[PDB]
Amino acid sequence: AQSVDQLIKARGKVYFGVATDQNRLTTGKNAAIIQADFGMVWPENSMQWDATEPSQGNFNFAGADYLVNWAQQNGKLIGGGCLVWHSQLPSWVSSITDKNTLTNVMKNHITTLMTRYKGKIRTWDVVGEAFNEDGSLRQTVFLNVIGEDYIPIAFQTARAADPNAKLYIMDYNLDSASYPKTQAIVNRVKQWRAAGVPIDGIGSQTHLSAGQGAGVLQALPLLASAGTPEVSILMLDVAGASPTDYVNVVNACLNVQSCVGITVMGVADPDSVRASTTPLLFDGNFNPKPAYNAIVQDLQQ
Template identity: 30%
Template sequence: MTSHRRAGWTRRSVAARAAALGTAALGTAVLGAASCRSALAAQGSGLASHAARTGRLFGTAVRSPDLTYNAGTRDEVLREASLLVPEYEMKWEILAKSPGSYDFGGGDRLAAFAERHGLDLRGHTLVWHLALPSWLPRQLDAREAKRLMEEHVTAVASHYAGRVQSWDVVNEAIDPQASDGMRTSLWMQALGPDYIPLAFAAAARADPKAKLYYNDYDLECDTPDQDVRRAKTLEILTKLRRDGVPIHGLGIQGHLQAGRWPYDAGKFARFLRAVSALDLDILITEMDVSDRLLPAPEAERDATVAGLAGDVLRTFLAEPRATGVLTWGLSDRQTWLNDLPTHRRTDNLPQRALPLDRNGRPKPLWTAMAQAFDAATPMR
């Protein structure tokens, strides 16, 4: 569930990140990416350093005002992350307040911050059923829907071409309750399932060097709905690959809910292997762990949250095509789960859903994530 509060290494980004951390020994331009990763892993103690030990990324969703005006958040990001994704500043309703007129200011500030500090940047999101501008009609014929969607994808992806390492091209296209498994969206109603390959083709034309991902949620746990979502995801990915559509990976959002659903490591591992068999990378893109259903004591909540996250991440990081993990914010003071009535705790205690507490201190969830990265299977 992507809200408004809500890969691969390049030689340039790794070397720049290491330089930002004060590494003097990286030296020459011929230093290979693997050597860069090893050098980076020796620096600092943030989650990105733990991830880099097996060639992976750790990142977080951010908002440009926080990076500009909140020194605490800025320091946390620079300590912990190697990859950033905008929480809301690349969504259509934010970018285009009127037809054909784009304001890229927020996204550009994030891109500049990432470049200045040697971080990678991920784009989110090009085609979604939510965050649509108010001027966009809610019903379109096929020709107009195709034109508007492709023009938007082209405008945004071409603007950030060469600055964004990957895109969530299509977000949340599946509805397990629908007879065909597809969400009834503006795009689905006008174009049918063909909107998905059309969006990927437009993104590839606009930014041929970016990695292109399909992104969805509720793919980890053991419920009938999630069984359907996993099966439909594999069906979509298989067809895209068979038809030669330019897609490079699957984004698994990772919005976990402690105490709600059972977790079956074997079932999740089989799904990951099936995605990998399609020659696709896999990235956890928006991880947090809701403690809404857990008892009030913080220590009990923290232990349960860390236990579930550790279980899921150990399964995920055993897959060699798992490229990294992003959380939807770093500190509990940033979590969107405290903003919506449907996600708040009924006792009104703030949720403890992210690796750092409200003061930026590592919690048991941080430790579980670091340990999962340390034990991860090397990437291939």
Template identity: 30%
Template sequence: MVLKKDKTVSSIVVSLVLGLTPGAFAQGIPSLKDTFQKDFGIGTALNPAQFEERDPKTTEFIVRQFNMATPENVMKSALLHPTWDTYTFEMADKLVEFGRKHNLKINGHTLIWHSQLPGFIRGIRSADSIRTFFTDHIKTVAGRYRGKVFSWDVVNEALNEDGTMRKTVFLQHLGEDYVTEAFRLAQEASPNTELYYNDYNNEKPAKRAGCLALIKKIQEAKVRIDGVGIQGHWHVGKVPLKDIEESILQYAALGLKVMITELDIEVLPRNFQGADVSQRMANNAESNPYPDGLPDAVQQQLAADYEALFKLFLKHKDKVTRVTFWGVNDGNSWLNNWPIRGRTNYPLLFDRNNQPKPAFYKVIALKQ
């Protein structure tokens, strides 16, 4: 059996299979945010078409399913700060207004990241100029959205896989204390906003150790850090549940909130792990195996993986404060175009028509 990408098993049939009563669907598809309202926030990543409300049905769907949102790109410095003395806030402002209008808490993403930097950074050679950019960017952006965003990913992906500091332009010119300084500046610019460190693979032991050391360094400097984001870019059938649980426990032991910030489960072949956007793969016939639909065996494994993950999140709901999916539906996922452009991927709970997949019902059934 193959489930076509533009079709889905009917809600009633799936509900009966999973033991959900037909009455649960009286108001249509169940709501993720309502189902987990007493446990943790449910977020999604939004693109301009979505927060500009170009399609009313999509807006209605987003508002029904999610109560938190993170911008995919519009708050990254390449788009927000394109030239040395120019900021372009129009799209970020629209995102923030979308959140205000529809009661979605906005997580700002991200103040400092080595990737998607403005082009002029490549021409800078002096540490003083990098520090000026670094300081002004944080103060200007965090200050503008003071009281308007719930939280910030202050620094994104500062670590290598072995837990050492990634060799970025900020490390090169500002030294290892740049992460602590970023949090200090963000705290000053937006004192009532929650401040997070965000990374991928920081549930793995070596990178986790580096992340814990980084957090302790910030705390020892008496600078506020409120939480840590585990991105959650995992692969079907290989979700590292033990490492995730141990990471939740160890991060929480430092007094931090824990978020799953960019959740998706890759179902296509990949010859590396993680989410380093600079990595690429060759495009060949084997790289896009499911252009017309996902085989039932893979669909069921995806559902089982999501069920196991949410069981774990519910077990630690006193520590996990948010679960954000990196995309509203399969068609929006960045994994369709990375690390190979034009693939057909199926990593989320909703198909390309915003219809729930078996994984969605497995997750919902945990609360029935």
């Protein structure tokens, strides 16, 4: 029908994107829909640490290469990540107890991934899910072994490896302005940037329940108050896929000058991690749902 990526670009934004990987691109109607309607792809899993560095210094790029090549052939922007995240670490990393060893391991992981795709990746998620719900820093292996400096080190290393890429910190439950995690990330990002840490963006990994879209209208401007050049909505899904919720999230990005775009968590409902809540923009027959059409209408006006 109409392409939400074409329409969001016409309104002055950079992209409407989607997460995918080789499996999805070879099944269903995912590749055709991504071709037609989305302008940026992100790897679901193929750039995570367990997929890319299964033993120390030994890298596996087959799945990531597939995605990057597909994106280049189809004219799509590419996001990558997450470089430093606790949730998909191989066991060899989480069993390092020495500060200097872990620092060197982290730097090598960052530099190797970013160098391989130098110049081809628009945005990297450098650090993900670093905050507890109360706003304190999450006690991961990186925090416990390296200390709080692991975040500055990660960003400084990434900037040196590919100065072209935008470097983001990413987290979830940043969907309400009054939630403690939201103000905490704003405060810390301000403090890090004032100390010279090159954080270009905050990516809000937006997983909503029904009715929560309205709150993003205040949360996203609050995130933008940290002063990063960019913010973005990442891995968006909404239980029930109400047009009202989806349009509120889109309008939050339109209202925030530094919001560069929106990425949804997948294409079609049956491939969602919460498929019973039918939370995506295409149904199990790959047809656009009412929320997709409502976004089109909102962007035309």
